[PDB]
Amino acid sequence: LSGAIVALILVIAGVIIAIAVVLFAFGLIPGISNQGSIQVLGSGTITNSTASGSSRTIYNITITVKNTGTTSISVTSININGQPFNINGTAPSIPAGRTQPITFEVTPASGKPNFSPGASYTATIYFSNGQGAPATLIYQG
Amino acid sequence: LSGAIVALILVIAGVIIAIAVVLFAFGLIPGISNQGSIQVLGSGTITNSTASGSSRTIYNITITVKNTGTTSISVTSININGQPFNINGTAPSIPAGRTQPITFEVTPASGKPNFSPGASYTATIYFSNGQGAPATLIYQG
Amino acid sequence: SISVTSININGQPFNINGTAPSIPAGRTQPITFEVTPASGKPNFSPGASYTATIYFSNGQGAPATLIYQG
Amino acid sequence: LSGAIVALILVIAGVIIAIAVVLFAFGLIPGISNQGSIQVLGSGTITNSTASGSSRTIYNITITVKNTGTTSISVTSININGQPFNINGTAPSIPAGRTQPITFEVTPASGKPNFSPGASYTATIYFSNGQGAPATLIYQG
Amino acid sequence: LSGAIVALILVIAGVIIAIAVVLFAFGLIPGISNQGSIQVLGSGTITNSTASGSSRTIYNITITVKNTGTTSISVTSININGQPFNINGTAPSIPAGRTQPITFEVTPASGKPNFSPGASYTATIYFSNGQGAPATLIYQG
Amino acid sequence: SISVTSININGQPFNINGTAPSIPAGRTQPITFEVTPASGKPNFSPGASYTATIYFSNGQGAPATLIYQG
Amino acid sequence: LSGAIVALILVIAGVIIAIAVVLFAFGLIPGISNQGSIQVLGSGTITNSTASGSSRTIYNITITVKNTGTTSISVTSININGQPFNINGTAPSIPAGRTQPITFEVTPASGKPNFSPGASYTATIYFSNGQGAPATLIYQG
Ligand SMILES: *[C@@H]1O[C@H](CO)[C@@H](O[C@@H]2O[C@H](CO)[C@@H](O)[C@H](O[C@@H]3O[C@H](CS(=O)(=O)O)[C@@H](O)[C@H](O)[C@H]3O)[C@H]2NC(C)=O)[C@H](O)[C@H]1NC(C)=O
Ligand SMILES: *[C@@H]1O[C@H](CO)[C@@H](O[C@@H]2O[C@H](CO)[C@@H](O)[C@H](O[C@@H]3O[C@H](CS(=O)(=O)O)[C@@H](O)[C@H](O)[C@H]3O)[C@H]2NC(C)=O)[C@H](O)[C@H]1NC(C)=O
Ligand SMILES: *[C@@H]1O[C@H](CO)[C@@H](O[C@@H]2O[C@H](CO)[C@@H](O)[C@H](O[C@@H]3O[C@H](CS(=O)(=O)O)[C@@H](O)[C@H](O)[C@H]3O)[C@H]2NC(C)=O)[C@H](O)[C@H]1NC(C)=O
Ligand SMILES: *[C@@H]1O[C@H](CO)[C@@H](O[C@@H]2O[C@H](CO)[C@@H](O)[C@H](O)[C@H]2NC(C)=O)[C@H](O)[C@H]1NC(C)=O
Ligand SMILES: *[C@@H]1O[C@H](CO)[C@@H](O[C@@H]2O[C@H](CO)[C@@H](O)[C@H](O)[C@H]2NC(C)=O)[C@H](O)[C@H]1NC(C)=O
Ligand SMILES: *[C@@H]1O[C@H](CO)[C@@H](O[C@@H]2O[C@H](CO)[C@@H](O)[C@H](O)[C@H]2NC(C)=O)[C@H](O)[C@H]1NC(C)=O
Ligand SMILES: *[C@@H]1O[C@H](CO)[C@@H](O[C@@H]2O[C@H](CO)[C@@H](O)[C@H](O)[C@H]2NC(C)=O)[C@H](O)[C@H]1NC(C)=O
Ligand SMILES: *[C@@H]1O[C@H](CO)[C@@H](O[C@@H]2O[C@H](CO)[C@@H](O)[C@H](O)[C@H]2NC(C)=O)[C@H](O)[C@H]1NC(C)=O
Ligand SMILES: *[C@@H]1O[C@H](CO)[C@@H](O[C@@H]2O[C@H](CO)[C@@H](O)[C@H](O)[C@H]2NC(C)=O)[C@H](O)[C@H]1NC(C)=O
Ligand SMILES: *[C@@H]1O[C@H](CO)[C@@H](O[C@@H]2O[C@H](CO)[C@@H](O)[C@H](O)[C@H]2NC(C)=O)[C@H](O)[C@H]1NC(C)=O
Ligand SMILES: *[C@@H]1O[C@H](CO)[C@@H](O)[C@H](O)[C@H]1NC(C)=O
Ligand SMILES: *[C@@H]1O[C@H](CO)[C@@H](O)[C@H](O)[C@H]1NC(C)=O
Ligand SMILES: *[C@@H]1O[C@H](CO)[C@@H](O)[C@H](O)[C@H]1NC(C)=O
Ligand SMILES: *[C@@H]1O[C@H](CO)[C@@H](O)[C@H](O)[C@H]1NC(C)=O
Ligand SMILES: *[C@@H]1O[C@H](CO)[C@@H](O)[C@H](O)[C@H]1NC(C)=O
Ligand SMILES: *[C@@H]1O[C@H](CO)[C@@H](O)[C@H](O)[C@H]1NC(C)=O
Ligand SMILES: *[C@@H]1O[C@H](CO)[C@@H](O)[C@H](O)[C@H]1NC(C)=O
């Protein structure tokens, strides 16, 4: 007598679980939309900031960043013209909804890159979303 | 003795329902074809079609539409420049195999659109077969 | 051995005129058969490709693409 | 005992349907080739072809068209200077492998076009194979 | 006492049948999971083989073919420029793991081709697995 | 400890030449074993990917991808 | 009682098989994800190697080739000016990570070339990966 009751319970539960899975599938997508929260807009600038040889060739990156997400997002790493770079201070963070000029100091990860006045160098800024925004920096130092 | 009888009933019912589900999966296929029956050809035209002191602005929209299905299909909604528009009157029907310049009247639902003479606007035409088609509309006046 | 029972072309059902072809087991063949529209009239265009579904005696249905040659 | 039987049925059906979908994906490919069968060669000519007091203006349009496919293809719509035009009469057919000067009659659908003698107009010719071709038409009178 | 023993019998039998179905599912994997395919490398050539004024047109098709699988595979059909062709004669077989220049004769299944010297035609070659490789064939005359 | 009972590579059966390798409990380790074609002579191309199903003593059949390197 | 235990068996087995398929998907990545390519740098040269009035025409082809990948790659065919050529002899192999001047002899697969001194001909060199590099070859005589 129990078999029919077990089958009934499993049928109804299967309906419920399938509907729950369907809803979860859609519930995923607003999370994934955060992968493109940030846009880097306008031409940035890179400037010599080394203090006449008193620092390990530390440069200044200024870029206008727009954040459309609901969370503050920070710059985790930067690559300039193929070369890795390391942020010298604490990472800048862009608040939600803002469009603002982020400025941060940077160091060569290896070697000593030489820049020419007025040249354009492509840099990829990697933000905490994992999003990598390409941008163009004009050297001004 | 009851349990074996119940198990027999449930086994046969499971066979029947599983076969029915498989056949339904096979039967779904023909309905998919109709999702692409229509394609919009070339640019279209928006025109201002409202009188002085009228309650509402109404725009005549003309687009060339090609239907490839067996059945007549009609427009259900249009979204121009991001704003959704509401279709006035009886929506035009596009005959089964014909290519026709179709014209229909729309009125803004979200807010007043500031169309500019001679400007080009992106739009999405949504047809009754559940198909959306990109289109480019020139505002003639 | 398996035989055709119906075909649906461009969302329109067609009836398999005549003795429906039978496909022998384990064999690859060119199969040709005549069909008539169950209702209405087709709007085929030369060179166009139409999605169809061919339904066989097991109830299984194979989707296919048919080009109209005129 | 029912669940294992149902699972067996569904597993085999899934194998069958997945293989069918893969074969359909492979079978779609030949239809893509026909989308580029036709190319328009050189400039064309528009001419005024309506009598006094007629209900409508009708323009003869002549264009050289080259067909490379196995099947005859015909014109379905034309869009001149942004305005869509409606093709009068039986649309001309372009034989499979031939290059021909084709002529057809059109009438304006959106509104009266103010063609200027000797002017050059951009147009898009839309053919029955779903292909659009840019063309340049000189208005001869 | 009967109910408990019957329920235990059905529980053990359900375990048996479920494990059998699971092992069947595991055994299906080798048949469906079959990597490797025939890859068509570079452009092939179509050459007119019809001779002596005989009634039937035959064309040589030469293509470079690389069988990445572990099984012998043969050509079953070809579609050129939207037109189907029949593989005249014993269809060529491509040995496993081998890259070969493969040449075979074809005849039009219907109609007549419109090939032009030096033109490039998109074709699809269908192999015994049902997979179909798109290729480009240049007509050499 | 669980052992490799049989292997199928790209649909073709294969036979282990030595004693079957055995994976101890809780371990993650590289199993390496010799194999022979059960029938025929399969030919592999450098850098190609071949799917193989390894059947373990549990009856579990794990699909995996092997890249030919010889 | 049988139904619940059978359902639990199938749930666990489904977890097992699904995770196995996911791991297979992860294992496919290295085979498909293969960066690096053979790059043809600058213009190459075609020189007439036919000598002694022998019946078969042979041409020297010299090109600068940079293998950016981690695998040895060889040429398989070349197409010059729309005409296929066969790589006479043991086809040259390009070692990994190396830039080399590569030279190989070719013969026309059909017909005869029409090369003119000083003319530049577009060619396509097909390598063992199936990738094909376009190049420009100058005929030096
Ligand atoms: C940005 O400004 C920097 C400072 O003007 C430039 O780098 C300096 O370049 C000079 C010559 O190229 C080099 O001598 C400096 O090096 C160091 O010198 C120190 C002594 S002193 O020169 O300061 O008196 C040493 O103590 C030290 O060990 C040396 O490494 C060098 N300075 C640094 C910090 O590298 C730089 O060229 C300029 N432009 C860019 C794009 O960076
Ligand atoms: C590939 O070769 C084919 C054979 O030469 C070409 O087809 C032939 O095309 C010519 C016209 O271009 C046509 O006259 C041939 O038709 C036959 O002609 C015979 C007499 S003769 O012409 O040989 O002197 C007749 O006896 C016969 O009844 C005709 O059918 C025609 N041949 C066929 C078999 O169709 C074809 O043009 C060429 N190119 C391509 C792209 O196929
Ligand atoms: C590259 O070199 C080729 C070989 O010298 C050139 O082809 C030769 O072209 C000449 C005419 O320009 C032609 O006469 C050759 O044909 C043969 O001639 C022999 C006699 S002799 O000419 O050597 O005195 C005959 O015995 C023989 O049967 C002919 O076939 C011809 N050679 C070949 C193999 O075709 C070619 O023009 C040159 N340039 C290019 C762009 O290929
Ligand atoms: C480079 O960026 C830094 C900010 O990180 C700027 O440094 C500031 O300089 C002003 C005076 O010019 C000081 O009052 C601030 O305290 C500095 N801030 C930090 C964090 O050091 C600098 O001005 C920028 N421009 C350069 C170096 O040319
Ligand atoms: C907009 O379209 C409407 C119909 O969709 C057109 O209305 C007709 O206009 C003509 C005169 O132009 C009248 O004779 C008809 O009685 C009107 N009604 C119908 C149902 O045809 C209108 O002309 C169009 N307006 C513009 C500016 O294009
Ligand atoms: C379309 O033309 C009509 C007039 O025929 C315009 O309607 C009125 O225009 C005046 C002046 O801008 C406004 O004060 C009224 O409010 C308008 N009426 C309505 C109902 O909007 C109308 O603005 C024109 N629309 C466009 C897009 O040009
Ligand atoms: C426009 O094209 C039409 C047909 O598409 C032409 O109509 C023919 O005109 C000639 C005289 O010019 C008559 O003898 C024929 O009876 C007409 N009909 C057909 C079907 O040929 C017309 O000539 C063209 N007009 C212009 C101005 O080019
Ligand atoms: C083409 O020529 C015809 C005359 O053969 C023109 O038709 C009439 O022209 C008068 C004067 O402009 C107008 O009042 C009528 O309304 C016109 N009739 C029609 C049906 O439009 C026509 O305008 C000419 N078209 C072009 C583009 O030149
Ligand atoms: C086309 O391919 C066929 C073979 O598939 C070639 O036919 C051979 O031609 C040679 C030369 O006359 C004969 O010795 C052989 O007996 C033929 N074999 C067959 C099977 O027909 C033909 O030469 C090829 N043509 C071209 C232009 O490549
Ligand atoms: C074309 O390349 C071939 C080699 O690929 C060269 O042939 C060599 O020629 C030299 C000089 O006569 C001989 O010593 C060698 O034995 C030849 N080797 C081979 C493999 O043929 C040929 O010289 C080159 N020609 C040009 C003009 O560069
Ligand atoms: C680097 O960052 C530190 C703080 O972390 C700051 O005091 C310093 O001025 C920055 N620049 C240099 C050249 O050290
Ligand atoms: C909207 O459409 C209806 C029916 O076609 C028509 O009667 C009405 O006049 C239209 N709106 C306006 C403002 O004219
Ligand atoms: C089917 O078509 C053929 C023509 O090829 C005709 O002879 C036959 O009568 C038709 N039969 C039916 C049932 O439509
Ligand atoms: C429109 O096309 C038809 C079909 O050829 C023709 O009879 C008719 O006259 C054309 N229109 C005019 C105004 O002549
Ligand atoms: C195929 O073509 C060859 C010509 O090379 C001819 O000898 C043979 O009879 C043809 N066979 C068929 C079935 O078309
Ligand atoms: C196969 O296994 C045996 C041991 O069973 C081993 O000695 C031998 O080297 C292996 N390979 C060959 C090629 O025999
Ligand atoms: C390739 O050309 C060379 C001439 O340098 C010749 O010795 C050799 O026999 C040719 N080989 C082939 C297969 O044509």
Author numbering:
A (entry chain Z), B (entry chain Y), D (entry chain b), E (entry chain X), G (entry chain a): 16 to 156
C (entry chain U), F (entry chain T): 87 to 156
Question: Anything the authors wrote about it?
Answer:
Here we present the structure of the Aap pilus from S. acidocaldarius at 3.2 Å resolution. Aided by the building of an initial atomic model, this map was sufficient to deduce the helical parameters, which we identified as a helical twist of −39.9° and a rise of 15.4 Å. Careful analysis of the filament’s structure revealed that the AapB monomers exist in three distinct conformations (henceforth designated as conformations A, B and C) These differ in the angle between the head and the tail domain with values of ~112°, 129°, and 121° for conformations A, B and C, respectively. Each distinct conformation repeats along one of the three left-handed 3-start helices of the pilus, meaning that each of these 3-start helices harbours exclusively one of the three conformations. In conformation C, the hinge region spans from I53 to I47, across a stretch of four additional amino acids where the α-helix is “melted” into a loop. Moreover, the distinct hinge of conformation C causes the tail domain to stretch out, meaning that it reaches further into the centre of the filament. Interestingly, the α-helical tails within the core of the S. acidocaldarius Aap are significantly curved, with the concave side of each α-helix facing the filament’s periphery. The glycan densities originated from asparagine residues, (N48, N60, and N88), which were all part of a consensus N-glycosylation sequon (NXS/T). While all six sugar units of the hexasaccharide were resolved in the threads, the map of the Aap contained only densities for the first one or two sugar residues.
Whereas the archaellum functions primarily in swimming motility, and the Ups in UV-induced cell aggregation and DNA-exchange, the Aap plays an important role in adhesion and twitching motility. Here, we determine the structure of the Aap, and show that it is solely composed of multiple copies of AapB. Each AapB subunit consists of an N-terminal α-helix tail, followed by a globular (head) domain.
